[PDB]
Amino acid sequence: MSKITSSHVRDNVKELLKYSNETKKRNFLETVELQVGLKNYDPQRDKRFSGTLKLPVCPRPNLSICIFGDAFDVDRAKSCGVDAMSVEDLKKLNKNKKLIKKLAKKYSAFVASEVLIKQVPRLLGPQLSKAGKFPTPVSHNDDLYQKVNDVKSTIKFQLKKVLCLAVAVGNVEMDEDTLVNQILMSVNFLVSLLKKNWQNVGSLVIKSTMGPAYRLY
Amino acid sequence: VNVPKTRKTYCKGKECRKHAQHKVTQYKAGKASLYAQGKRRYDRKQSGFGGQTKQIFHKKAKTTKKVVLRLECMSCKTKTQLALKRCKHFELGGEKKQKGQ
RNA sequence: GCCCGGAUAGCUCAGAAGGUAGAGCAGGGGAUUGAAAAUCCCCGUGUCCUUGGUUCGAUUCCGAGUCCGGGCACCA
RNA sequence: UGUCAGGUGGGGAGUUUGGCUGGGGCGGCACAUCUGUUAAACGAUAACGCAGAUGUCCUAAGGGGGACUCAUGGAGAACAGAAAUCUCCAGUAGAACAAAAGGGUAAAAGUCCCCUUGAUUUUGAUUUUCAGUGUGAAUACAAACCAUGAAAGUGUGGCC
RNA sequence: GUGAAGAGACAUAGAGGGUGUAGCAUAAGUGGGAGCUUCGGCGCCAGUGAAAUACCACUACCUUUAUAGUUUCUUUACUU
Numbered sequence: 031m032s033k034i035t036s037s038h039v040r041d042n043v044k045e046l047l048k049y050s051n052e053t054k055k056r057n058f059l060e061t062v063e064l065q066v067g068l069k070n071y072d073p074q075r076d077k078r079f080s081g082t083l084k085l086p087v088c089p090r091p092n093l094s095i096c097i098f099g100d101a102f103d104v105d106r107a108k109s110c111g112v113d114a115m116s117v118e119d120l121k122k123l124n125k126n127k128k129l130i131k132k133l134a135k136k137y138s139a140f141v142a143s144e145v146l147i148k149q150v151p152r153l154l155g156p157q158l159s160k161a162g163k164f165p166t167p168v169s170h171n172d173d174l175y176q177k178v179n180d181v182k183s184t185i186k187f188q189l190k191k192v193l194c195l196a197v198a199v200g201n202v203e204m205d206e207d208t209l210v211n212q213i214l215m216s217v218n219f220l221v222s223l224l225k226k227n228w229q230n231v232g233s234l235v236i237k238s239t240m241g242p243a244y245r246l247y
Numbered sequence: 248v249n250v251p252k253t254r255k256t257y258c259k260g261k262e263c264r265k266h267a268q269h270k271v272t273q274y275k276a277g278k279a280s281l282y283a284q285g286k287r288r289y290d291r292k293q294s295g296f297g298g299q300t301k302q303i304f305h306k307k308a309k310t311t312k313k314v315v316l317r318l319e320c321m322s323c324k325t326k327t328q329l330a331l332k333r334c335k336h337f338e339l340g341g342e343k344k345q346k347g348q
Numbered sequence: 349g350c351c352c353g354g355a356u357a358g359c360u361c362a363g364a365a366g367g368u369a370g371a372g373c374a375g376g377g378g379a380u381u382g383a384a385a386a387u388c389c390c391c392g393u394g395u396c397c398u399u400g401g402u403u404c405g406a407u408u409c410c411g412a413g414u415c416c417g418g419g420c421a422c423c424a
Numbered sequence: 425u426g427u428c429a430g431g432u433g434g435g436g437a438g439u440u441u442g443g444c445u446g447g448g449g450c451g452g453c454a455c456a457u458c459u460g461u462u463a464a465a466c467g468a469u470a471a472c473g474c475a476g477a478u479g480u481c482c483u484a485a486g487g488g489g490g491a492c493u494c495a496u497g498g499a500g501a502a503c504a505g506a507a508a509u510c511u512c513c514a515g516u517a518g519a520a521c522a523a524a525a526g527g528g529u530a531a532a533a534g535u536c537c538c539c540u541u542g543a544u545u546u547u548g549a550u551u552u553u554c555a556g557u558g559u560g561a562a563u564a565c566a567a568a569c570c571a572u573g574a575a576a577g578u579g580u581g582g583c584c
Numbered sequence: 585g586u587g588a589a590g591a592g593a594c595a596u597a598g599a600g601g602g603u604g605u606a607g608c609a610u611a612a613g614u615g616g617g618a619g620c621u622u623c624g625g626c627g628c629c630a631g632u633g634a635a636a637u638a639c640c641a642c643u644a645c646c647u648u649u650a651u652a653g654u655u656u657c658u659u660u661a662c663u664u
């Protein structure tokens with residue numbers, strides 16, 4: 031009630047994030063995610079659609095970024111926190127299978143310039159695949175300092191071969207009433223794919239890294 | 248017969264109202280719905296004692312059936328219908344070509 | 349038009365869930381016997397109906413499309 | 425026992441069980457169409473007359489532009505032979521053009537190479553069978569919107 | 585009309601149930617994920633692969649049952 035339990039939506043957050051015993055407390059910035067249970071859970075014959083819809087309030091489990099920019103973007107990247115890379119450097123990474131797995135699992139975010147979106151998904155593709163961390167659309171005239179927010183804001187919506195999604199919804203840094211709000215947006219994009227959402231005001235928990243048995247609906 | 252899949256053609260549109268790209272899918276007939284005026288007139292009549300108060304066709308000579316193409320626009324996604332001459336086989340897309348062996 | 353079942357070596361018939369490609373019919377040689385049969389041994393034979401697909405891999409599984417053989421429906 | 429629904433039910437009830445046709449029936453299609461001829465040098469024209477075809481196949485075998493000549497024969501080139509590929513000379517079509525047959529076509533309507541969707545939209549006028557009714561096909565424009573070519577042009581499906 | 589006792593669940597339940605191969609080792613999956621913990625230990629780290637593990641949770645796939653809820657019911661008794 032009150033637009034998906036607005037009374038105990040922020041008190042849920044207030045009791046988790048600022049706690050060492052209940053929420054363990056890691057050194058990196060603790061990110062929050064959701065879970066919801068619809069009656070629409072069918073494996074399907076057609077197979078699942080998967081449409082990566084954006085959100086204006088930023089999702090963003092961004093630890094490291096490994097770019098592929100050249101000429102303009104190498105100058106812009108080195109000034110910022112990220113680190114640049116060359117075209118011939120990609121051939122050295124692919125030459126052994128181990129260093130591809132380091133780029134796959136940890137380095138989640140990506141930035142690739144307009145000229146370097148014509149050589150990328152061949153070598154990584156088969157080895158990567160299940161993670162699905164491919165580059166973002168970027169041109170040479172971008173700012174890079176601002177472009178970190180665009181990758182951070184966007185998130186995957188792939189649903190195949192399992193009856194669950196887990197879309198992130200802010201973190202420790204973001205405001206209290208945003209997270210949730212985001213809750214209205216996050217569920218709405220599930221309603222875009224499915225027919226019957228079950229049923230506007232459904233189920234939630236708050237799982238911020240060490241989200242304990244606080245268990246929601 | 249084979250057809251290209253997508254093709255350029257005129258659409259009425261009203262925006263628009265010129266040549267543009269299209270998708271191509273095959274037209275299938277809808278289910279009879281059970282609440283049309285003729286079905287209600289038929290079921291009211293056919294109830295009592297008498298048995299089949301109308302004609303039942305079973306002198307079907309010819310073999311095939313005309314193929315129809317449901318064209319769907321790209322921009323405003325309005326739809327049209329373009330018929331085709333009678334043929335037994337029909338692959339909507341798209342085993343080209345070949346020539347020049 | 350509906351919802352089901354089956355396809356495998358030249359022939360015929362298994363296969364069976366997770367990782368193979370097989371008994372037989374024959375067909376070819378050995379072993380055995382004074383020989384002629386019956387029996388132990390060692391071979392050659394595959395688009396696993398057809399396509400993209402599905403898959404770490406699959407004839408299977410998984411979902412499409414066409415070819416063979418059997419059922420309950422019928423107002424131009 | 426009563427009402428409604430599913431099977432069974434010639435035990436009984438009602439009704440139909442083509443036409444042309446050297447009598448009918450058995451065959452056949454001459455019963456919707458197309459080519460040549462019968463058909464008597466405008467058109468029209470019969471028989472279960474004669475020789476034969478159709479219920480399809482094609483995103484190219486449709487549309488535009490540019491290259492180039494085919495049947496067959498002769499003279500020469502290792503394996504190569506009557507027949508493989510290569511080169512020259514003669515070559516009015518004696519080839520080819522999705523199928524029946526007739527017509528048509530040679531810097532092409534044939535063969536090869538480049539780009540595409542005029543097999544598109546809105547409606548009427550007009551030839552053929554003809555009651556100058558319909559059905560089918562075909563021809564010539566108007567207003568649009570496109571393709572192709574340096575252009576003139578050509579194209580509202582298949583050379584007729 | 586009136587009484588007795590055997591079966592399919594839907595709530596709602598976590599104990600587990602998972603052993604091809606390479607991987608300390610019996611990996612059903614999906615996310616967050618660099619420390620929880622006094623120390624202990626196990627992870628990040630490193631490494632084997634198609635897939636990474638702790639620490640937290642959600643979803644399946646199979647067994648279990650002890651809930652007085654649905655009825656496919658199935659078994660007998662009582663006279664008006």
Ligand SMILES: [Zn+2]
Nearest residue numbers: 260263320323
């Ligand atoms: Zn339009």
